[PDB]
């Protein structure tokens, strides 16, 4: 419900319209990573290191599993019933994903059984399955590691020194689990983390593990950037330094009667500088009302914007009526610099300041110009075939709108300023006009 | 691979009464499954994906559930024009399989 | 309405090959995923192949895969399926089909008959 | 101080009380780091790889030598003067830093004198001691690779071979050395680098060079998260390509008769929308008064901020005024996106949007419903035992306050929008209207 | 043209001027990079593991192929004249890249001849040359990573177990590439992408990419930290899984009559409190006008500001006035915290605040203090040779200024907020009252 | 005011065993760490063991590594050491202290007694 | 191990009196080292932590200094409640050890 | 290494005669190719810098363009003062060398 | 004006060496790198050495590598550059240039001779 043919000349053109569409109702699969590698085939020689790995890691892992452990002893069964006096203090977040953590443990109960076989599996990646009801895939940190790298040079290197490297290949591994499963995450209930965090459990390798998991399709690429594929953990067990995993798969959401549009913007001339008109590039239409969206946190497509969450954020009606057609509302801002572009294709017509652009027409020679009565000037293929800017030459299409554009004006609004400081400022300024006329509207009431 | 077995392969039934079949998973696949209709001479219909949700358009006669290895598919109140095949499948992982494939028949 | 048909089915004597193919209308073709669901006499149903949406990504069941290839042309909104050293263990119905996010497979062709048979 | 029994209408519920505390007065430890390996094993095959290695060693660290330099050529002892003609220009900070930089050469002059035993290591990490005067922990980079992954294949893989793989690792280690110790790092004087930084300088295993100097316990998970620990460089030697580095380790100070509040905000409905009401989320109370704490820079855990420096910051008057109970001057924002939280627990209990949100009582069977006369509905435990919003189940606690809560009204103050652009929308429709009042007071005034 | 002995009282002390350049005009060299690794000396034990990786490549390279084949369509030689009804929408940078990727084809088309060697080349970094016409450096990921460690093991490791450490590295490849040329990339024609993302192609290794190109001077570090260097993509092989990547090398340009000047921010005190003022803390000045700049953006040096594109903004009235002398309009801020400067040193001279900080002088053991009257208090070696604040000693200059600079008083500006939340409030205070008056107008006016 | 008190001291004969334990009272036992400190005869002071505020953590010297645990229950607020191969060695007074930020000992209390012998 | 040495192992005074006692480290300890007061039929008390610094109720009488190995105790003003046993120890790294002890004695 | 042939050695003209030398690269160099003039008794001037663009001072009768292998230098109205030897230097890589250079005679 | 001064110049016997030096003057010597430019007597150029801006790298020909070297003090304003073992083949004018951005001669001081004989 935009007025681009209004837009276009306060310098904002039409772009590409994108589909909008929200992350909702996942299906679970779950894994079991181990924190602490098989070292049985070099038993011989790891000195004291393991030891000393096992108690950091308790020491790291203990802080998890008792703060998610007091969600787990205030439920009962009833679906499930859970205990508003016992957790006390809490947000709506934090409590959905403390029903989803009971609920969980079905599964977690079955993988648990396996502890046994978890606990001596020899490999980076191994599939256990004993039972219908218990099958699961567990991946080992640094296992590969130590069967490529130390065990095959054990007979080359001193003991002494395979001691030094399993602990210098450890220590690097507890450094990278530090900058998430150290004291940041302060929070092991919620289910919002992405699971390229919690792959750093396996050194980072988040690839193996949703190809051990699922298979590819390029639908796949863009939900794992959007971080739409998130993870929760759900069981700790300090006994054998492992802990299982809960990742969800989303399905995608289309919003119906709604969509993205981007605007291009062109720097244009009002008088004698260049100035830039100030909207949101990327508006979001729903049925006939318009809101912003906070797209810098959602991957952008060619054909659609895929977010994780509703972005939806209030517009003031200044901006609607700027929008749609009352431009006298639209603020600009002044051209300083010389990275400002000054010119823009859409549709194949050209949108284009011809006052600070050397603009000619290829097609017969004859310069192009534009006098100080158009904010920008639009060039297209009824006029000029064929057009040059600068040094780039480019053949122009129709442009099926208004025969006579380049004749007519449109209302400015006026300059502002939208630098930090500058903000501060215009609020101080602002504040000593208004304190000064409300002594003069005293003295005009008293007399 | 992951395979499941149907049961009953066949089962009578009034009109009117409620009637349910039940898979079985060979390993646990989440809710990773789903349910189809199957009329004489057409392609099979789409009724349950996900394990618990309807398709667009599916009756509220239909309806199902469970999770892990076993699951169950219910007709409330069967109709003449229910008395045809029915199917589930897996989509845990490939290669996607499916059950045996059930029938209801008229007492 | 989304209409899928698929054509190209007819005799094969074995050791032949066939190829299969089905036009989509009434949805975007070049948004979503597809395969190939195969039906015996015996109303068993079979996965046969799918392909992704961009054509970079494909699967097939040991029992077809290096004989079997699918393959899409987005630019004609056709799904094709080249069936080679076919075996009279092949005879089938053969359907097209639309999948949903996963693989659940939401809208279904008539489907067509594919039979091998080394008789006059 | 605030009137939480107001603040809850409004929608902000009292969340949890965590104690202030800051970094002061650190204790010192001093290691040295070798940036370049030790290839005697492996010398017959090493090429002209380490020559070039080491020019580019000093390219990089030429520049740290002379700018520390700099603050060590103009002091002399008085504790010490420091020449303020001679450094010229300088920060506060800069300065404190110079000083410490003087101080600390009591310790890298009988550190260098055990140069020569520097110079030859031939391990990752090594104690040296020859006195009780000079003693010192080096950690050397890349020596690990060279000892484990080379030098046990020099028989296996032909010369040239072994020489393009340590020219690869040197150029990968002097790849990640460049984002800190390159030319980014323009004041090596100043001792605000934390650990993490500087640990890049043996691989970003700083997990090696803490446990090499201390011992592990949960409060130094804090500090180091915190980034409380921080380090200086003393000296650079570029004849040897080895730096000696100051680690600081802080004593945490607790600010007394101070505590930060957390506030949980639900959305509320004034009229026929949803609102969200703003405040900062987290309240720094000292003494009597209230002030704002840039808590993005500060650890939290679950009882305490651990700040690496003071976060106070000023607060307008009119938020003081809102928080102690004139709620009329608290601002609201329009909701939009359908991602605000409706509901929050506090002390067993509930306070939630009942027209946005399906409510009722299990306990019973009714429903429970809200009148468009209020902003959040409070539920607890004397009119229903146990409560289901959407699809959780809840038991509740009891209300200790006001027995009539949901009966009594509250002003609400005005809309306000936060965008970027409407920032900068507002503040030029405001002055388009001032300016025009100006005006109408002159003509006022004329006649 | 600024006042610095007026901004000195207000507490914004001199620092050091800098000059100014931007990046322009570049040279260019072509490189090749595979994705993929040679196996060939392994090729008895791979498995399937080369098959599934070609597969994902595909998928990962197939939309970056083409995306910028819509830019190769849609021109044809003239320079060139591109179709604007063919690209339809487009913005002036992407123009001009595309226009770019034409003109590189040159080079593609005689690289692509080449592709016989590049196809079995068998080194991590490998020269080809055949003719003058073609010629061209090949780097290769992750192929010593398979000549150093798995081909040496392939007689000590089961084969099976060769083929998971195979997958693993090429998972772990992967999952890097996909930060860079993953669907985040949605726009592989313009030229803006440094070249350390796209190193990591190559492992991240930037150093071998552009040592293998060039040479090393102390210039070339500071335009790689500047991020003045770029690549792009000119030609995709999918049936090689080798991309070409053009790198360009800019000549840094410096403006004529320009520069940059730091200011050295001291909190002073006007009443009863600390106060800090609000200016950029970095001017940039061309011939007459002040102008602010965007300098989070560019690298600092200690001669010059180096930036890759301009970021001069515009800087509103009010502060012109503050910075040439009027300094009643420059706004202040309320200190709270305890970690704001209270001294800085400059030419010799300090400028300190002596209410808040201990200052004597030590030549005479005679305290300095600061009446009510000063804002900061100057000090230098006319009045007292050396002087301690806290606990630091230092020498003093001369003030080449006024000899009675602590005589003479200063206006001061109003108080201002800068927080977000206190921003919203502010407007809406203002709001407030400029309603109240405008109906208070309209009572005057019709009396 | 810090109120530690040690109990649990006595006569034990050489390999026999002891448990000590030293409640806390007036400062939150919870927040900070602890240690054992022994006194010889001789008046020699010698640390015996600590253990970090979530008793994640703990450190002993070589002469009791292996043979005595320390350990906390904080919901008792008490520390707890367990001496196991008792030693005539080990004859001394056992203290109960607070550490502050590093291991300075801020706080003991009035400690008990350990003796070890064969004689009746 | 780090250990020191501390002397004399006693020393007379006269009341009023200023008493001076030395710590020396077989390695340097930075400046992590702490001094106690011990009086008879009592446990240790701290007196100055991280060298330089008194504990909270330490009387003025008491100052100390010191860095790397060598470090030192001081009384400005002996008092007849002070002559007592006095230590030092090292908080540099494990194991944490004290120093001999040392005894003031009335001339 | 890369080396480049510049030719002809040895070129006449007419004064106002416009004229044309070339230099041919081993290996393709982009366009990091620059032009010098020397006269007699005196040191080399800079005259083309990065193949195409004029060095500071220089006159619009000097022009040049090229990339890849191959580069040529123009003069479009030759002066007495312009028949004097003309080089050819690469700077793609080191070490850099200079062509064997040309000269101008007056016919 | 850019005055670069070479001098240094004369006869060495073969097996010899020379310093020479070149001073710079009217712009900032420590903001530009620079080199050595040799010319025969047959007036082929050849490139000797380079030296970077802060004097951290330099490069060299294999033909004088090892036998030269280049050095600056930026204090003094001053490019100096060692030669060693000359030869009958280093005779020339040796030329002191300051380099733009890359390897471009910008500017050219007069040149100094250098001549190499056993000659009496
Ligand atoms: C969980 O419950 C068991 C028994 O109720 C209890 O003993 C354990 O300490 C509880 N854990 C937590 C963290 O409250």
């Known amino acids: 419900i935009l007025h681009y043919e209004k837009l276009s000349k306060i310098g904002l053109v039409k772009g590409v319209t994108r589909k909008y569409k929200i992350k909702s109702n996942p299906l679970t699969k779950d894994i079991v990573i181990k924190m602490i590698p098989n070292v049985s085939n070099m038993s011989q020689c790891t000195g004291s290191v393991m030891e000393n790995y096992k108690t950091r890691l308790n020491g790291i892992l203990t802080p998890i599993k008792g703060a998610l452990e007091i969600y787990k002893n205030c439920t009962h069964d009833l679906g499930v019933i859970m205990a508003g006096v016992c957790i006390g203090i809490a947000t709506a977040a934090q409590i959905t994903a403390g029903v989803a953590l009971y609920e969980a443990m079905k599964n977690a109960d079955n993988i648990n059984k396996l502890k046994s076989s978890i606990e001596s599996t020899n490999e980076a990646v191994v599939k256990l399955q004993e039972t219908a009801e218990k099958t699961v895939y567990v991946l080992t940190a640094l296992q590969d590691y130590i069967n490529t790298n130390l065990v095959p040079t054990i007979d080359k290197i001193s003991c002494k020194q395979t001691e030094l490297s399993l602990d210098l290949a450890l220590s690097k591994y507890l450094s990278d689990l530090l900058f998430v499963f150290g004291p940041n995450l302060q929070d092991p209930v919620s289910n919002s983390m992405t699971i390229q965090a919690i792959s750093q459990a396996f050194g980072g390798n988040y690839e193996t593990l949703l190809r051990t998991l699922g298979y590819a399709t390029e639908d796949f690429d863009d939900l794992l950037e959007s971080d739409s594929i998130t993870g929760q953990i759900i069981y700790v067990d300090l006994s054998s330094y492992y802990i299982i995993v809960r990742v969800y798969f989303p399905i995608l959401t289309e919003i119906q009667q709604a969509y993205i549009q981007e605007l291009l913007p062109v720097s244009f001339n009002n008088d004698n500088s260049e100035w830039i008109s100030i909207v949101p590039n990327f508006i979001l239409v729903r049925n006939t009302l318009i809101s912003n969206i906070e797209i810098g946190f959602c991957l952008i497509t060619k054909r659609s914007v895929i977010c994780n969450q509703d972005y939806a954020t209030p517009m003031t009606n200044n901006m609607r009526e700027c929008l749609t057609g009352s431009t006298e509302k639209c603020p600009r801002e002044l051209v300083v610099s010389s990275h400002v572009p000054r010119f823009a294709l859409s549709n194949g017509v050209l949108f284009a300041n011809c006052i600070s652009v050397t603009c000619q027409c290829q097609t017969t020679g004859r310069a192009i110009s534009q006098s100080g009565e158009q904010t920008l000037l639009m060039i297209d293929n009824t006029t000029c075939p064929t057009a040059v800017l600068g040094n780039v030459i480019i053949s122009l299409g129709k442009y099926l709108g208004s025969v006579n554009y380049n004749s007519e004006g449109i209302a400015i609004g006026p300059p502002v300023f939208t630098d930090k400081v500058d903000i501060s400022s215009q609020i101080s300024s602002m504040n000593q006009s208004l304190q000064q006329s409300k002594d003069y509207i005293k003295e005009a009431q008293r007399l | ?107 | ?120």
Chains 1, 4, 5 share one sequence.
């Open chain 3, 1 to 120: 309405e989304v209409q899928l048909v698929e054509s190209g089915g007819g005799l094969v004597k074995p050791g032949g090959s066939l190829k299969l193919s089905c036009a989509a209308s009434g949805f975007t073709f070049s948004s979503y995923d597809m395969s190939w669901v195969r039906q015996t006499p015996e109303k068993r149903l079979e996965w046969v192949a799918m392909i992704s949406s961009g054509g970079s990504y494909s699967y097939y069941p040991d029992s077809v895969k290096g004989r079997f290839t699918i393959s899409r042309d987005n630019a004609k909104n056709t799904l094709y399926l080249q069936m080679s050293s076919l075996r009279s263990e092949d005879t089938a119905m053969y359907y097209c089909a639309r999948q949903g996010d996963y693989a659940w497979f939401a809208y279904w062709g008539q489907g067509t008959l594919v039979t091998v048979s080394s008789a006059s």
């Open chain 2, 1 to 107: 691979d992951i395979q499941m077995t149907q049961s009953p392969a066949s089962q009578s039934a009034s009109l009117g009464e409620s009637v349910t079949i039940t898979c079985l998973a060979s390993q646990t696949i989440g809710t990773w499954l789903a349910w189809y209709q199957q009329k004489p001479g057409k392609s099979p219909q789409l009724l349950i994906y996900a394990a618990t949700s309807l398709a667009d358009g599916v009756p509220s006669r239909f309806s199902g559930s469970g999770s892990g290895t076993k699951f169950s598919f219910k007709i409330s109140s069967l109709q003449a024009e229910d008395f045809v095949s029915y199917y589930c499948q897996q989509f845990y992982s490939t290669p996607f399989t499916f059950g045996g494939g059930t029938k209801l028949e008229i007492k």
